[PDB]
Amino acid sequence: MKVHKGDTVLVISGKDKGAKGKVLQAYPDRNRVLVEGVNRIKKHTATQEAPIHVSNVMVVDSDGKPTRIGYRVDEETGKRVRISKRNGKD
Amino acid sequence: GKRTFQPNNRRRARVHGFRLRMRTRAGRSIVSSRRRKGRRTL
Amino acid sequence: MAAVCDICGKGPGFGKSVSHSHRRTSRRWDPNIQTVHAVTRPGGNKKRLNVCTSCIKAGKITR
Amino acid sequence: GVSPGELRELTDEELAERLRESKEELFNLRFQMATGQLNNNRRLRTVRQEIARIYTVLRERELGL
Amino acid sequence: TLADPRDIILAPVISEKSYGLLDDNVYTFLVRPDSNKTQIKIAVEKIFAVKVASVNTANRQGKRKRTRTGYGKRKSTKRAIVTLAPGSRPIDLFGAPA
RNA sequence: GGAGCUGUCAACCGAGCGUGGAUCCGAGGAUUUCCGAAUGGGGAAACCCAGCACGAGUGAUGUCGUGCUACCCGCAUCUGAAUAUAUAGGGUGCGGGAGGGAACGCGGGGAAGUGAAACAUCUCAGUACCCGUAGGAGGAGAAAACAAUUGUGAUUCCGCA
RNA sequence: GCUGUGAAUCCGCCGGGACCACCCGGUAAGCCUAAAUACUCCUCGAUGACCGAUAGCGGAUUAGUACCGUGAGGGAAUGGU
RNA sequence: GGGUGGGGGAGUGAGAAUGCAGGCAUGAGUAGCGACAAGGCAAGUGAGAACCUUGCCCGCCGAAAGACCAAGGGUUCCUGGGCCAGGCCAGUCCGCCCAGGGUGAGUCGGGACCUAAGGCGAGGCCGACAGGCGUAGUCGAUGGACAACGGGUUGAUAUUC
RNA sequence: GUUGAGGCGAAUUCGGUGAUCCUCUGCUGCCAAGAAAAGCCUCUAGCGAGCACACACACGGCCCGUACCCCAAACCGACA
What we know:
This is part of a larger assembly, with chains A, B, C, D and E.
Chain A: E1 8-11, E2 20-27, E3 32-35, E4 52-53, E5 57-59, E6 69-71, E7 82-84
Antiparallel strand pairs in A: 1-2, 1-5, 2-3, 3-4, 6-7
Chain B: H1 9-16, H2 18-23, H3 25-37
Chain E: E1 9-12, H1 16-20, E2 26-31, H2 37-48, E3 52-58, E4 78-84
Antiparallel strand pairs in E: 1-2, 2-4, 3-4
Chain E binds four RNA strands through residues 1-5, 15-17, 20-21, 26, 28, 34, 36-39, 41-42, 46, 55-70, 79-81, 83.
């Protein structure tokens, strides 16, 4: 995954398609993440958010529509800058 | 008269122990076969 | 007394014994090894040496 | 805990003294483990790692460094 | 490396029996199954700066606990019973009577 | 290389770490209990008991820690008996070996079953198996060879004959 | 290869399918020699008109385990929300 | 994940091998339920008791159905807890399952002392090789040597504390 | 003595019978003629200048097993 806890994503598939929210947790090998307010589970003791597979979401560029995460050349003493297409900024 | 087997581990070691297998060239070849098959030896 | 010649490496030959009916069996051709004492210089200690006859004809000849 | 470089700036006796201190630390902590009087369990790992650092510093100290 | 007696004693044995043994300052510890009575007296007397009267050692086997198919086995830890002499200083195992 | 980790089995807890570069992946390095060719000696392997030296410790024996000590072969080298030279042997020191390794190769050893509608000769076969002993490939090799007058000019391997 | 007898140094010796003569080829009884070649326990990558859990190695699952046998050795079955 | 059609290629068609692996039937709720020592009663535990518990009777071995060692087994001992499965039934209890605890040695039986029968067996002899026998030396007890007796206690240990 | 524990606690004298044990590694008798080595004691070669014996005080005295069954339900017999 190219996404971490500080990113906001849009659900692009599934019954929750259209939902946005902040990433709360990630499980790399499973490639599943927790997103506030997406897949609710009406079970508590004995609306809990469930992990969803990354390919059903797309990272929002924080400046409009969903975008694809890309990399460039910057380095600057060990610092990989993460950008995107269509006016990438971070 | 009516018996079949009367175990005694000391004797078992001195007779069937792998130390005795090491004593001979033949015994060593036995052990090396057991290693390849993957078994716990005597 | 067919030990490999101490000073040559001559060992025994192995092969067959062709009987009248051509029936083969196993036999051995041991070299004619004789017992001699080993001497390196005049008045030596006379150790021992199992040696082939060809060397008795020429080589470590003591007595 | 203590950084390896900080350990490397010490000569000999400071190393032995810190070593003894850490062994006493494990000596106490595992007794607290035996009796249940301890929450911070990872402290054991910290101290064991410190000891290992001490020994490797000693070997490199005598040998090529 | 050299002169390290603290690695011999691993812990104090916590049981009703070891509680009863507190009388006359007799304390039970788990030890490395390599050491002996002499290392134990030397280490304890040095570490705690006390007088040990005598030490009665024992080995003990673990229990062969069953799994879903096969069997396991816990460690067969060696232990030792340290009897302190009359007049020596009692030691405080962190306020842990057992 | 990069934001999450504390392996898995079976995952419920607890307590911590992480932008100062964690966890993780690759190399190098140190450490590396005990057994095993096993090599200080012994031995029901994973046990026991010792010697020497340096060092730790005790009022003092005990105890501990780290190195060293198997055998054989060869080399150097001292003495070199029995007896006179002298040698075997002995002593000191320096190098190497043993054991593993799925298959392949070389040298040496060497059956039966079966076939032959019996069966010995023969075959199955110089196979199975075993011993020695290496290698990365090995072995073989540079003509005291072929052909028989076109003559060729180290070896090995495949296909024809 | 083994045992006894036991040659020569170029007007020599060996060989050319018993053997002799002529002719021809070549000089043994010291050593080293890569390439073409044989095999894959094992380590990456790739394919497959090969099976898809009574098949594939026996081993997709605590596998050479459990278990049987004093021992050499023999040697299981169990996948799917 | 498959149909129609032309082609290619098969571990290709199960009804039997006293066939194999799995599952399930008849016999059948039959036989059997494991020495010709014998149980019975009351109260109690408990959803549930002829089989566990506590009391009281009865009966049996008593040179063994008693109490201790070795060999062997290798946690089966104790406490607490459970009763899907096991025990030839039930079974609150157990030598079944889980968790936890428990084995204290200068003097008891072994190594720290040797040794017989006997094995290894450098050196060495013999043997194609592998290898076989065997001296020194060293191992190997049921033997020989060697210093301990009584009482009490814990849930369990005892010539051990 | 909620019967778990705990406390008090007398007399303990004569005789008989009688061992497979000790005296006995002994005595007597028979023929099958009945184990090594250490250890122990003693003697010399050897070490030989600081040792030998009595009293007390103080030390240290190693390692495995030591739980549970022993003609049995726990070992060998495929099972209690």
